[PDB]
Write a protein that holds these residues in place. Structure first.
Motif, mmCIF file in Angstrom:
data_model
loop_
_atom_site.group_PDB
_atom_site.id
_atom_site.type_symbol
_atom_site.label_atom_id
_atom_site.label_comp_id
_atom_site.label_asym_id
_atom_site.label_seq_id
_atom_site.Cartn_x
_atom_site.Cartn_y
_atom_site.Cartn_z
ATOM 1 N N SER A 36 8.998 15.121 4.700
ATOM 2 C CA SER A 36 9.734 14.909 3.457
ATOM 3 C C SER A 36 9.172 13.725 2.670
ATOM 4 C CB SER A 36 11.219 14.675 3.755
ATOM 5 O OG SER A 36 11.406 13.527 4.566
ATOM 6 N N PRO A 37 9.262 13.784 1.330
ATOM 7 C CA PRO A 37 8.772 12.728 0.430
ATOM 8 C C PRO A 37 9.711 11.520 0.390
ATOM 9 C CG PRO A 37 8.606 14.900 -0.574
ATOM 10 C CD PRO A 37 9.566 15.007 0.571
ATOM 11 N N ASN A 38 10.961 11.742 0.788
ATOM 12 C CA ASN A 38 11.974 10.692 0.802
ATOM 13 C C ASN A 38 11.901 9.879 2.090
ATOM 14 N N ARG A 39 10.691 9.455 2.445
ATOM 15 C CA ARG A 39 10.470 8.665 3.651
ATOM 16 C C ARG A 39 8.992 8.318 3.802
ATOM 17 N N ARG A 40 8.676 7.559 4.846
ATOM 18 C CA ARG A 40 7.302 7.152 5.118
ATOM 19 C C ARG A 40 6.931 7.587 6.531
ATOM 20 N NH1 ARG A 40 5.066 0.845 5.240
ATOM 21 N NH2 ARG A 40 2.856 1.325 4.840
ATOM 22 N N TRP A 41 6.094 8.614 6.640
ATOM 23 C CA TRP A 41 5.686 9.093 7.953
ATOM 24 C C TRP A 41 4.470 8.324 8.458
ATOM 25 C CZ3 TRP A 41 8.422 13.102 10.532
ATOM 26 C CH2 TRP A 41 9.503 13.603 9.786
ATOM 27 N N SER A 42 4.743 7.365 9.338
ATOM 28 C CA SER A 42 3.720 6.516 9.930
ATOM 29 C C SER A 42 3.659 6.766 11.433
ATOM 30 C CB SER A 42 4.059 5.053 9.658
ATOM 31 O OG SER A 42 4.328 4.863 8.284
ATOM 32 N N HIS A 43 2.445 6.834 11.972
ATOM 33 C CA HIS A 43 2.274 7.089 13.394
ATOM 34 C C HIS A 43 1.170 6.287 14.074
ATOM 35 C CE1 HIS A 43 4.184 10.918 11.959
ATOM 36 N NE2 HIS A 43 4.871 10.771 13.077
ATOM 37 N N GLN A 52 -4.584 16.978 11.015
ATOM 38 C CA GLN A 52 -5.307 18.230 10.852
ATOM 39 C C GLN A 52 -4.469 19.196 10.031
ATOM 40 O OE1 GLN A 52 -8.653 16.914 13.125
ATOM 41 N NE2 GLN A 52 -8.125 18.157 11.326
ATOM 42 N N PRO A 53 -5.045 19.739 8.944
ATOM 43 C CA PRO A 53 -6.411 19.495 8.461
ATOM 44 C C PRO A 53 -6.598 18.189 7.681
ATOM 45 C CG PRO A 53 -5.338 20.946 6.968
ATOM 46 C CD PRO A 53 -4.398 20.799 8.148
ATOM 47 N N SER A 54 -5.504 17.653 7.143
ATOM 48 C CA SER A 54 -5.564 16.416 6.372
ATOM 49 C C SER A 54 -4.275 15.610 6.496
ATOM 50 C CB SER A 54 -5.819 16.736 4.901
ATOM 51 O OG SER A 54 -4.766 17.526 4.375
ATOM 52 N N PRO A 55 -4.333 14.306 6.172
ATOM 53 C CA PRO A 55 -3.167 13.421 6.247
ATOM 54 C C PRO A 55 -2.145 13.704 5.154
ATOM 55 C CG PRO A 55 -4.923 12.285 5.189
ATOM 56 C CD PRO A 55 -5.529 13.548 5.759
ATOM 57 N N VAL A 56 -2.533 14.529 4.189
ATOM 58 C CA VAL A 56 -1.645 14.881 3.085
ATOM 59 C C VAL A 56 -1.063 16.276 3.295
ATOM 60 C CG1 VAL A 56 -1.417 15.094 0.592
ATOM 61 C CG2 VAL A 56 -3.099 13.511 1.559
ATOM 62 N N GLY A 101 -2.081 11.544 29.875
ATOM 63 C CA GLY A 101 -1.064 11.824 28.879
ATOM 64 C C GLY A 101 -1.212 10.987 27.629
ATOM 65 N N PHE A 102 -0.446 11.329 26.601
ATOM 66 C CA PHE A 102 -0.500 10.599 25.353
ATOM 67 C C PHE A 102 0.882 10.413 24.780
ATOM 68 C CE2 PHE A 102 -5.129 10.780 24.439
ATOM 69 C CZ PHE A 102 -5.518 11.734 25.390
ATOM 70 N N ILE A 103 1.042 9.320 24.044
ATOM 71 C CA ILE A 103 2.298 8.998 23.408
ATOM 72 C C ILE A 103 2.038 8.927 21.917
ATOM 73 C CG2 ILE A 103 4.159 7.343 23.169
ATOM 74 C CD1 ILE A 103 4.129 8.384 25.934
ATOM 75 N N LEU A 104 2.828 9.655 21.149
ATOM 76 C CA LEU A 104 2.700 9.624 19.704
ATOM 77 C C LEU A 104 3.982 8.965 19.257
ATOM 78 C CD1 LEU A 104 1.199 10.573 17.133
ATOM 79 C CD2 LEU A 104 2.832 12.458 17.077
ATOM 80 N N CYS A 105 3.872 7.859 18.525
ATOM 81 C CA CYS A 105 5.058 7.152 18.055
ATOM 82 C C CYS A 105 5.173 7.118 16.528
ATOM 83 C CB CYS A 105 5.067 5.712 18.576
ATOM 84 S SG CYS A 105 5.247 5.425 20.376
ATOM 85 N N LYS A 106 6.360 7.445 16.021
ATOM 86 C CA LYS A 106 6.607 7.408 14.582
ATOM 87 C C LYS A 106 7.191 6.037 14.235
ATOM 88 C CE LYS A 106 9.302 9.085 10.690
ATOM 89 N NZ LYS A 106 10.476 9.830 10.132
ATOM 90 N N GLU A 107 6.701 5.441 13.153
ATOM 91 C CA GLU A 107 7.174 4.130 12.718
ATOM 92 C C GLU A 107 7.564 4.138 11.238
ATOM 93 O OE1 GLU A 107 3.606 1.775 13.740
ATOM 94 O OE2 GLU A 107 4.553 1.358 15.687
ATOM 95 N N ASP A 128 -5.153 3.041 15.337
ATOM 96 C CA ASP A 128 -4.954 2.598 13.969
ATOM 97 C C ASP A 128 -3.827 3.419 13.397
ATOM 98 O OD1 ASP A 128 -7.020 0.697 13.740
ATOM 99 O OD2 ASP A 128 -8.491 2.314 13.507
ATOM 100 N N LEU A 129 -2.953 2.774 12.635
ATOM 101 C CA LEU A 129 -1.821 3.457 12.021
ATOM 102 C C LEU A 129 -2.288 4.665 11.202
ATOM 103 C CD1 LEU A 129 1.184 3.470 11.510
ATOM 104 C CD2 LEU A 129 0.855 1.795 9.696
ATOM 105 N N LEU A 130 -1.464 5.712 11.167
ATOM 106 C CA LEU A 130 -1.780 6.935 10.427
ATOM 107 C C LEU A 130 -0.553 7.356 9.624
ATOM 108 C CD1 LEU A 130 -1.751 10.119 10.026
ATOM 109 C CD2 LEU A 130 -4.046 9.140 10.142
ATOM 110 N N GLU A 131 -0.658 7.285 8.300
ATOM 111 C CA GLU A 131 0.447 7.662 7.417
ATOM 112 C C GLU A 131 0.207 9.017 6.762
ATOM 113 O OE1 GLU A 131 2.147 4.625 4.756
ATOM 114 O OE2 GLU A 131 0.742 3.190 5.670
#
Lengths: 9, 100, 185, 275
Positions: C154-161, C104-108, C127-133, C179-182
């Motif tokens: 940061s752009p120097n990485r891959r934010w996957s959750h 929210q509001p967008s993945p970018v 409860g909920f678990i949010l995991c970064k991969e 489903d994965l969310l980048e």
């Protein structure tokens, strides 16, 4: 003894 | 809309003692919606002659039911309760432990 | 003596039904092993007779609700019990329908910024678990949805959750992962 | 301390036909009446000995009224379906509850009337029994409709009179069952985990009512943080059960005692595992 009616939602 | 998963406790009406008649209970609660399937099993085999209380619920609105059947504890017979509900990816099974 | 290491193979996060082995790796002179589980006795293990146990390998053929929890182990050597191993959380996933993970509001999002990630489901999880991969770093909130503020991005990485939901009556039993969310920068 | 409640659930079933409607009444933890739209003969029927005696006018009225509740809630199911703009092929649940609580003296202490839709709170009568609380915008519609109809008065009238009045009637007919507390039969069990620890489980069986307090003390002190506690469960005979556990190191059992508090006990008994 139960109330006569249920509310009309 | 909101759904809740079923919780389970499997136990006997009286302390278990092999050879002595008793009642096996499967208490299922906290679920939503009410559509649910619950089976009592003896060594994997579903038991058809079972009684269940009237469907009811808590003031948290979640539903709860009790399933039971007369049974006689065995040193080798394994009992379990199986529940299926829209909140579960697969049925939830709980083996009966006379210590709980 | 040296503090033992306790780990699970394939991993500490296993999908319902799969096998997993908890191995306590102490010294080579280890003469015995003790496996603990907090807030509730590790009932099983007493069925995993026996040489395997005395060798530090406690295998579960098929994981179920009853095997989850936070474990710790210690071994005996040179007439001394070692210190407790760092804890290992055995989690079972795939118990409930996967929840929805959105941005929210967008993945970018612009670098150095931040975005709100919302995990939502039709199930009222406690409860909920949010995991970064690598090796996931997760966060748990406290229902129909959970809100997680992540960043800076940061752009120097891959934010996957990925996110999971769990019932308060069994916090180590999670739903199937979402489903994965980048994120994009 | 007594209370009486009536609960109902209307579950739509598209295709399956008309919505299923079930309702029941309780005095404390005892169900005394039940109704199910599915029965070959849908009607309010006795579930407790102390009400089976009521005359035929009673059952005729209890039945006639509840059928009217069913008809109303079925209408409510589609009205709310309209408010939330929902499919006609989806299943939905409208739950209802009403009740009165008496104090020690037997006077109305607090009343209630609430509706929940698909698991969430929808409309509720406030403690003052003179106003409402809507959970969302759709409920605000139902709320205004209730206010414009000045129905709150009709509901509190029931809660302050009939509810309390009949509660007393039932409490007397079943004085033996409802105003009697059966103490819990209790004991402790030992569960050895090899040689380094064991779980001490404290049981409370065959008690009534359901309210009970089970706690573990070490050298006299609540281990309440590390104690396992299962939801209180029905034994199936009308009584209840509950146990509390605590993992302890071998050779420290005696330092632990179970504290059990129940309405049927002259004084909270204290238990300890017997070697």
């Amino acid at each position: 003894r139960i109330i006569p009616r249920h509310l009309q939602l | 809309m909101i759904q809740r998963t079923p919780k389970i406790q499997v136990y006997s009406r009286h302390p278990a003692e092999n050879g002595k008649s008793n009642f096996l209970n499967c208490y299922v609660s906290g679920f939503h919606p009410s559509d649910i399937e619950v089976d009592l099993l003896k060594n994997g085999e579903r038991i058809e002659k079972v009684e269940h209380s009237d469907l009811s619920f808590s003031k948290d609105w979640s539903f709860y039911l009790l399933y039971y059947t007369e049974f006689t504890p065995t040193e080798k017979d394994e009992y379990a309760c199986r529940v299926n509900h829209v909140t579960l990816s697969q049925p939830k099974i709980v083996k009966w432990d006379r210590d709980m | 003596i040296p503090k033992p290491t306790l780990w699970a193979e394939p991993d500490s996060v296993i999908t319902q039904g799969s096998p997993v082995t908890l191995s306590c790796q102490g010294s080579l002179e280890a003469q015995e092993y003790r496996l603990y589980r907090e807030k509730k006795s590790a009932s099983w293990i007493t069925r995993i007779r026996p040489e395997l146990v005395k060798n530090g390998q406690f295998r579960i053929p098929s994981i179920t609700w009853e095997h989850t929890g936070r474990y710790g182990c210690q071994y005996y050597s040179r007439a001394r019990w070692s210190e407790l191993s760092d804890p290992l959380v055995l989690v079972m996933t795939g118990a409930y329908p996967k929840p929805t993970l959105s941005a929210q509001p967008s993945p970018v999002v612009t670098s150095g910024g931040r975005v709100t990630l919302q995990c939502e489901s039709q199930v009222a999880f406690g409860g909920f678990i949010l995991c970064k991969e690598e090796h996931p770093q997760c966060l748990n909130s406290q229902s129909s949805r959970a809100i997680f503020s992540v960043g800076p991005v940061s752009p120097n990485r891959r934010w996957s959750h990925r996110c999971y939901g769990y019932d308060l009556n069994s916090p180590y039993v999670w739903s199937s992962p979402s489903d994965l969310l980048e994120l994009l920068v | 301390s007594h209370s009486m409640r009536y609960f109902s659930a209307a579950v739509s079933r598209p295709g399956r036909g008309e919505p299923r409607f079930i309702a029941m009444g309780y005095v404390d933890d005892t169900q005394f009446v039940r109704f199910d739209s599915d029965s070959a003969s849908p009607r309010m029927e006795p579930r407790a000995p102390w009400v089976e005696q009521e005359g035929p006018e009673y059952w005729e009225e209890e039945t006639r009224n509840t059928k009217a509740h069913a008809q109303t809630d079925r209408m409510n199911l589609q009205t709310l379906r309209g408010y939330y703009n929902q499919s006609e092929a989806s299943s939905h649940t409208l739950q209802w509850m009403i009740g009165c609580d008496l104090g020690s003296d037997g006077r109305l202490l607090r009343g209630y009337e609430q509706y929940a839709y698909d698991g969430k709170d929808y409309l509720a009568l406030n403690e003052d029994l003179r106003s409402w609380t809507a959970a969302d915008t759709a409920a605000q519609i139902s709320k205004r409709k209730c206010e414009a109809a000045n129905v709150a008065e009709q509901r509190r009238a029931y809660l302050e009179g009939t509810c309390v009045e009949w509660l007393h009637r039932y409490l007397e007919n079943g004085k033996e069952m409802l105003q009697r507390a059966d103490p819990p039969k209790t004991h402790v069990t030992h569960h050895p985990v090899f040689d380094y620890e064991a779980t001490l489980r404290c049981w409370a069986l065959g008690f009534y009512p359901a309210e009970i307090i089970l706690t573990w003390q070490r050298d006299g002190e609540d281990q309440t943080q590390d104690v396992e506690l299962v939801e209180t469960r029905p034994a199936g005979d009308g009584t209840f059960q509950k146990w509390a556990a605590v993992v302890v190191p071998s050779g420290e059992e005696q330092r632990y005692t179970c504290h059990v508090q129940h309405e049927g006990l002259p004084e909270p008994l204290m238990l300890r595992w017997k070697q």
